[PDB]
Design an enzyme around this catalytic site. Structure first.
Site, mmCIF file in Angstrom:
data_model
loop_
_atom_site.group_PDB
_atom_site.id
_atom_site.type_symbol
_atom_site.label_atom_id
_atom_site.label_comp_id
_atom_site.label_asym_id
_atom_site.label_seq_id
_atom_site.Cartn_x
_atom_site.Cartn_y
_atom_site.Cartn_z
ATOM 1 N N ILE A 80 0.684 -1.154 0.095
ATOM 2 C CA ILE A 80 0.068 0.072 -0.072
ATOM 3 C C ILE A 80 0.893 1.377 -0.129
ATOM 4 O O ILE A 80 0.398 2.280 -0.420
ATOM 5 C CB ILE A 80 -1.116 -0.124 1.190
ATOM 6 C CG1 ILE A 80 -0.375 0.121 2.488
ATOM 7 C CG2 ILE A 80 -1.803 -1.242 1.178
ATOM 8 C CD1 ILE A 80 -1.631 0.682 3.629
ATOM 9 N N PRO B 178 10.192 1.602 0.646
ATOM 10 C CA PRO B 178 10.419 0.330 0.145
ATOM 11 C C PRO B 178 9.867 -0.713 1.078
ATOM 12 O O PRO B 178 9.674 -0.735 2.189
ATOM 13 C CB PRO B 178 12.048 0.383 0.554
ATOM 14 C CG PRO B 178 12.224 1.290 1.628
ATOM 15 C CD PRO B 178 11.019 2.312 1.376
ATOM 16 N N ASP B 179 9.546 -1.743 0.299
ATOM 17 C CA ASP B 179 8.930 -3.277 0.891
ATOM 18 C C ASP B 179 10.319 -3.783 1.496
ATOM 19 O O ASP B 179 11.190 -3.992 0.548
ATOM 20 C CB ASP B 179 8.471 -3.973 -0.266
ATOM 21 C CG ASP B 179 7.870 -5.395 0.196
ATOM 22 O OD1 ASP B 179 8.012 -5.764 1.469
ATOM 23 O OD2 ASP B 179 7.174 -5.974 -0.791
ATOM 24 N N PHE B 180 10.361 -3.864 2.568
ATOM 25 C CA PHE B 180 11.538 -4.460 3.522
ATOM 26 C C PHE B 180 11.853 -5.750 3.250
ATOM 27 O O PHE B 180 12.948 -6.085 3.151
ATOM 28 C CB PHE B 180 11.575 -3.836 4.869
ATOM 29 C CG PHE B 180 11.521 -2.652 5.014
ATOM 30 C CD1 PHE B 180 12.497 -1.654 5.064
ATOM 31 C CD2 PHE B 180 10.294 -1.779 5.451
ATOM 32 C CE1 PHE B 180 12.473 -0.287 4.946
ATOM 33 C CE2 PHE B 180 10.031 -0.479 5.617
ATOM 34 C CZ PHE B 180 11.469 0.293 5.506
ATOM 35 N N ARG B 181 10.616 -6.706 3.043
ATOM 36 C CA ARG B 181 11.023 -8.023 2.599
ATOM 37 C C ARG B 181 11.214 -8.409 1.270
ATOM 38 O O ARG B 181 11.805 -9.342 1.147
ATOM 39 C CB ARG B 181 9.672 -8.735 3.303
ATOM 40 C CG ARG B 181 9.919 -10.129 3.219
ATOM 41 C CD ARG B 181 8.786 -10.737 4.465
ATOM 42 N NE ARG B 181 8.635 -12.228 4.065
ATOM 43 C CZ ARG B 181 7.825 -13.037 3.428
ATOM 44 N NH1 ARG B 181 6.837 -12.164 2.436
ATOM 45 N NH2 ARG B 181 7.559 -14.309 3.066
ATOM 46 N N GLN C 56 0.724 -3.872 8.967
ATOM 47 C CA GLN C 56 2.131 -4.620 9.039
ATOM 48 C C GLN C 56 3.255 -3.426 9.057
ATOM 49 O O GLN C 56 4.383 -3.628 9.354
ATOM 50 C CB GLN C 56 2.305 -5.761 8.130
ATOM 51 C CG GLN C 56 1.380 -6.921 8.547
ATOM 52 C CD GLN C 56 1.322 -7.959 7.329
ATOM 53 O OE1 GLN C 56 0.526 -7.471 6.368
ATOM 54 N NE2 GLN C 56 1.959 -8.941 7.584
ATOM 55 N N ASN C 57 2.871 -2.320 8.506
ATOM 56 C CA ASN C 57 3.651 -1.220 8.060
ATOM 57 C C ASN C 57 4.032 -0.397 9.171
ATOM 58 O O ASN C 57 3.129 -0.251 10.107
ATOM 59 C CB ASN C 57 3.163 -0.258 6.960
ATOM 60 C CG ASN C 57 2.955 -0.938 5.619
ATOM 61 O OD1 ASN C 57 3.193 -2.407 5.569
ATOM 62 N ND2 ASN C 57 2.046 -0.474 4.775
ATOM 63 N N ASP D 214 5.794 2.550 8.560
ATOM 64 C CA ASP D 214 5.846 3.945 7.972
ATOM 65 C C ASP D 214 4.820 5.294 8.447
ATOM 66 O O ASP D 214 5.072 6.186 7.863
ATOM 67 C CB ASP D 214 5.708 3.700 6.476
ATOM 68 C CG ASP D 214 4.147 3.361 5.870
ATOM 69 O OD1 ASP D 214 3.271 3.471 6.917
ATOM 70 O OD2 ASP D 214 4.380 2.819 4.736
ATOM 71 N N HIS E 82 3.299 -4.287 14.286
ATOM 72 C CA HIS E 82 4.592 -4.190 14.485
ATOM 73 C C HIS E 82 5.132 -2.900 15.014
ATOM 74 O O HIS E 82 6.268 -2.578 14.840
ATOM 75 C CB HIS E 82 5.547 -4.523 13.039
ATOM 76 C CG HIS E 82 5.382 -5.891 12.667
ATOM 77 N ND1 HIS E 82 5.771 -7.028 13.201
ATOM 78 C CD2 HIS E 82 4.866 -6.288 11.493
ATOM 79 C CE1 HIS E 82 5.254 -7.796 12.514
ATOM 80 N NE2 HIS E 82 4.709 -7.667 11.384
ATOM 81 N N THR F 7 -0.461 -7.156 0.642
ATOM 82 C CA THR F 7 0.160 -8.059 1.394
ATOM 83 C C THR F 7 -0.014 -9.403 0.693
ATOM 84 O O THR F 7 -0.925 -9.782 0.436
ATOM 85 C CB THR F 7 -0.619 -8.162 2.668
ATOM 86 O OG1 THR F 7 -0.541 -6.584 3.407
ATOM 87 C CG2 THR F 7 0.036 -9.003 3.811
ATOM 88 N N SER F 8 1.019 -10.202 0.844
ATOM 89 C CA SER F 8 1.181 -11.613 0.599
ATOM 90 C C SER F 8 0.514 -12.605 1.354
ATOM 91 O O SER F 8 0.200 -13.752 1.091
ATOM 92 C CB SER F 8 2.718 -11.939 0.168
ATOM 93 O OG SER F 8 3.434 -12.075 1.382
ATOM 94 N N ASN G 245 -4.298 -6.300 -4.630
ATOM 95 C CA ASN G 245 -2.884 -6.755 -4.521
ATOM 96 C C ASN G 245 -2.653 -7.010 -6.121
ATOM 97 O O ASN G 245 -3.240 -7.324 -7.084
ATOM 98 C CB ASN G 245 -2.713 -7.821 -3.830
ATOM 99 C CG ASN G 245 -1.278 -7.883 -3.196
ATOM 100 O OD1 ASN G 245 -0.803 -7.122 -2.667
ATOM 101 N ND2 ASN G 245 -0.724 -9.140 -3.480
#
Ligand SMILES: CCCCCCCCCCCCCC(=O)O[C@@H]1[C@H](O)[C@@H](COP(=O)(O)OP(=O)(O)OC[C@H]2O[C@@H](n3cnc4c(N)ncnc43)[C@H](O)[C@@H]2O)O[C@@H]1O
Ligand SMILES: CCCCCCCCCCCCCC(=O)O[C@@H]1[C@H](O)[C@@H](COP(=O)(O)OP(=O)(O)OC[C@H]2O[C@@H](n3cnc4c(N)ncnc43)[C@H](O)[C@@H]2O)O[C@@H]1O
Ligand SMILES: CCCCCCCCCCCCCC(=O)O[C@@H]1[C@H](O)[C@@H](COP(=O)(O)OP(=O)(O)OC[C@H]2O[C@@H](n3cnc4c(N)ncnc43)[C@H](O)[C@@H]2O)O[C@@H]1O
Ligand SMILES: CCCCCCCCCCCCCC(=O)O[C@@H]1[C@H](O)[C@@H](COP(=O)(O)OP(=O)(O)OC[C@H]2O[C@@H](n3cnc4c(N)ncnc43)[C@H](O)[C@@H]2O)O[C@@H]1O
Ligand SMILES: [Zn+2]
Ligand SMILES: [Zn+2]
Ligand SMILES: [Zn+2]
Ligand SMILES: [Zn+2]
Lengths: 286, 287, 287, 272
Positions: D32, D39-42, D98-99, D101, D118, D193-194, D217
């Site tokens: 999102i 950046p997508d950290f994963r 989950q973000n 940011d 988180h 999200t995956s 997604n």
């Protein structure tokens, strides 16, 4: 001043092709034999030290400690049974060192490994410093006997779960691995005092360089000698890839086999390497 | 001192009923999935290796070698089209392992197969070591990307005859099979170092044990640990059925499904097994 | 009288390193599994008991009472759906007890939890008194039948919102939790009578010590036995941390994981503990 | 009884327009915010450093990484403001994120609307339990960019951003919200999200079996959703950009202009 035109694998390859790169020393460890099915020591989950719980040791290092061995040899020999490979097939990385030999570039291979795969790849005794000894031969531990036993005898005892005892004197028989508490082989002392005065390239592969005195070897080379690391991670032996003073050290991060293929491709050797690997693998399998 | 009272299937079954037999390891290969419509590798005429001439390979193994793949991926994906099954329906053998799991006997199933059928049969990832990886997920080959793609994406590329490329980076996408030249999965290393210290029975099914290091696994078990082979033929990895020193190895020669039914009968599980298979097959057919 | 040189974690750690401390009993509750995503019972707003309104019970405890279960099973299974974890991943605290086992220090873990995480962490049946039973297995409630069903079977029923019924007799199928009104497990009485007479240290973690007869266990050790509480708050009884007569009880107030990490550091076990947690957690995360 | 008339965005919108759909929970991840330059950290191209005990001994690596990864600006996406509109129309029960940011808060979601799974980078706290002094984003930033390890102005202990580090407990609100929210949810909206990381991934299976679930997604989510099989009855995948999915959904609800206007004016305000 700087021997490498740039601090990249491409720069290393161009230096290797130049007139001044004549003598190469390889310094290797357990990471070059993971793709042959032998676990390393320090990798999380897969490494030996992350898999010692069920041996119920007083501390992780005891299983490779000479004084613990003489009192409680059982855990070591149980471990030997679980790790013994059942075929000894060298990796692409091992054969890349064989190419270095065949093209007259290899001064020496210093190895921390005991798997004998350098020898099977076709490196001869003179090409090698086996800094941790070898599993290839075994000896009675009594200094007043020291009866030698070949791999086939030791293998037999390991898989039949009988603690190796000497046929003359009934003492323990141990593989010629340099356990913690034993002296390094004479060849380490003799070769290290001359090899590093006049070496043109160091190739460090599949080691974290965490153990002295092996780790100190790379610092013995001339200040100007380029050094290439092919490893999964940046190792902990005074190499300087990143600082403003960086001038000679190059890291290629990834698998040892891939790095060796990539370097071979830059040298025009990739086809020769892959043919050699195919022929020797085919031979070992038959 | 010998843990089996006789070197027969009956002997193994009685041992399996006894208090001593608590942890079983299955070691399986392509033989257990032939009745699911997937050819094995080494059977004469029917196996994959007798059916590669039309791909015009420099040497037979090239089609499964990572270095050849990166250069010429077309033969692999044309082969994938010819072998990809219409449905993923596990066999009686796979459901026998499901029973071992449900009855608290299965420590681990080590599989050489990439067909995902152990999972479909209800073995969880924790119960499994997928020694050759899986077809179930795919990945971009670039180390600095590794974009993950599902079965449905990979399946579509295979049947449309278009070579799978990354959407992000345009490099090849490869199924998570361990090709020749690739490292074995990390889980093989970790499980192999603990599973064979304390195992009460090995069940070896549908494999010729020609390939290392998988073949060496059976020699890691204790000397006393009984080992049963259910396979069409004797395997080419250190088992001793017939010599004068034979004490613990038993070969039941025939089809994997038939051997498992025979063993299940002897254990009193045949009806439960047959009912589970019928139920699960009907359910998969219905999808 | 005073077996600890000082009433601090450091005193406890030096006592544990010595020859004087060979047998440790852990007494654990829901606080050791909050970091694994399972709520505790008594914490305001976050605890289970503060979140029962929506189940329209006649009174709070009914959802865990055997007699009410048999008449109205539905609220229990709707609650089971809402709390059933995404994975069964033991905490640092669980693995600290695993270390106690591996070093030969663990006499017993007495647990009030049903989450099975002690087992998954590698504590064997013999090391455990599962005082509230377990979610790992389920049984038909009828004494003349008592068909056993595995976790996978129970999960399927829970998530499909179908009340579990036995395939043979259609009686309700219950997880092996010791519901209120049920007899305590035999192991609770038999282990207590030999464990607490030779315990060298009590380690009390993640429990309010509010429920009897479990709470009373801490007074069963000899009067000289040191007792360490690792908990967010002082436990509500019998323990004397603070008076001028205090001599053997030590409170470390904070998160169980952090308390166990601190204790391990003092013992020289921090790296051993962290390596173990990392490899077990990485394995579970790859399912 | 299927709550959707058809398994499309249009079916979802008509369900959303009915009296039955009052309570929406958003389940969101890094997808999102990639349109906001976060950046997508994963993602591989784009563990002691996030562990609480290591942080208390060697905090320098974390704050050096914080300096490097600190975004140029905090500017929420069309997707975030779609959630703001859900809040403003009385539809948002909760956003589970989950973000870290902070873009949900900037978009105007209040702490009461949020379960930050988180934690959050927005506020920071001194590590001493006997102090626990709060510090704003503006104070932490000044410490990060001056390359001085942040210390507490009262007790000189380390100040840590409210990210949930490894070895720290789940936040209180995760437990208090999760236990009631999913019993009365009418629609799950899963975006960017995956759904491969636990225990967050399991939140979708806590809703009743009848609850429609919409995935917005780029790809199919890899935790127990059924779009394709002949048993599919409730799960809808809209494949593509989160922003574009939200525009298309907004359009079907008659909110497209309102959404565009909100986005534009907030973007302008933030840039200034
Ligand atoms: C024939 C086998 C028979 C089995 C019998 C068992 C005998 C075991 C031998 C006992 C050895 C003596 C005692 C001992 O512990 O020695 C250790 C050892 O000699 C020394 C030096 O360790 P080392 O060789 O440096 O190995 P490490 O595990 O410490 O490091 C390996 C490095 O490589 C990397 N790596 C891993 N895989 C790959 C790969 N595929 N490609 C690229 N890189 C790879 C890892 O990331 C790591 O950096 O430190 C220790 O005293
Ligand atoms: C899911 C989509 C499928 C399409 C994709 C196709 C891609 C294929 C990927 C190949 C993987 C690359 C590397 C590779 O070649 O692996 C091979 C393989 O994994 C490994 C081990 O081979 P294996 O699994 O042991 O298979 P074999 O064919 O060598 O042996 C099968 C054995 O079973 C017996 N058998 C046969 N049928 C039955 C039966 N019904 N009942 C009882 N026994 C049976 C045969 O008599 C034989 O002994 O050796 C080879 O490297
Ligand atoms: C696996 C599937 C799970 C879903 C299934 C749902 C069913 C589970 C219910 C089982 C039925 C049992 C009936 C029952 O109510 O038993 C309860 C229970 O077994 C017994 C004993 O209660 P307990 O275990 O002592 O739980 P409490 O909530 O009373 O106390 C927990 C303590 O811990 C502290 N704490 C919290 N978090 C932390 C932390 N991270 N670090 C340190 N401390 C922590 C709290 O501050 C508190 O002091 O009293 C109650 O009858
Ligand atoms: C700032 C200061 C610096 C300190 C920061 C320290 C950090 O834990 C992490 C966290 O719990 C979890 C998150 O998992 P996550 O949010 O699910 O991230 P994933 O990478 O698993 O999923 C991303 C998904 O989204 C999709 N996506 C991407 N972009 C778009 C787009 N524009 N439109 C539509 N979809 C999009 C991708 O296609 C992908 O499916 O993964 C990790 O453990
Ligand atoms: Zn001798
Ligand atoms: Zn890519
Ligand atoms: Zn029944
Ligand atoms: Zn402070």
């Amino acid at each position: 001043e700087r021997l490498l035109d740039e601090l990249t694998l491409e720069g290393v390859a161009r230096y290797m092709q130049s007139e001044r790169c004549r003598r190469v020393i390889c310094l290797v460890g357990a990471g070059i034999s993971t793709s042959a099915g032998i676990p390393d020591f320090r990798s999380p989950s897969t490494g030996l030290y992350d898999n010692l719980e069920k041996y119920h040791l007083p501390y992780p290092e005891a299983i490779f400690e000479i004084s613990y061995f003489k009192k409680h040899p059982e855990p070591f020999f149980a471990l030997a049974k679980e790790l013994y490979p059942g075929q000894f097939k060298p990796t692409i990385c091992h054969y890349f060192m064989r190419l270095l030999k065949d093209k007259g570039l290899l001064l020496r291979c210093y190895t921390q490994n005991i798997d004998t795969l350098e020898r099977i790849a076709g490196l001869e005794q003179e090409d090698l410093v086996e800094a941790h000894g070898t599993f290839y031969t075994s000896h009675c531990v009594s200094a007043s006997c020291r009866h030698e036993y070949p791999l086939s005898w030791m293998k037999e005892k390991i898989f039949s779960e009988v603690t190796p005892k000497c046929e003359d004197c009934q003492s323990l028989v141990k593989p010629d691995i340099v356990f913690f508490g034993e002296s390094l082989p004479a060849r380490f002392f003799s070769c290290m005092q001359s090899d590093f005065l006049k070496v043109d390239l160091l190739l460090v592969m599949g080691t974290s360089l965490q153990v002295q005195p092996f780790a100190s070897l790379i610092s013995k080379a001339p200040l100007s000698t380029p050094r290439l690391l092919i490893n999964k991670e940046k190792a902990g032996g005074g190499m300087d890839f990143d600082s403003k003073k960086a001038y000679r050290d190059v890291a290629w991060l990834g698998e040892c086999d891939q790095g060796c293929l990539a370097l071979a491709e830059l040298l025009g050797w990739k086809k020769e390497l892959e043919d050699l690997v195919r022929r020797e693998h085919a031979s070992i399998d038959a």
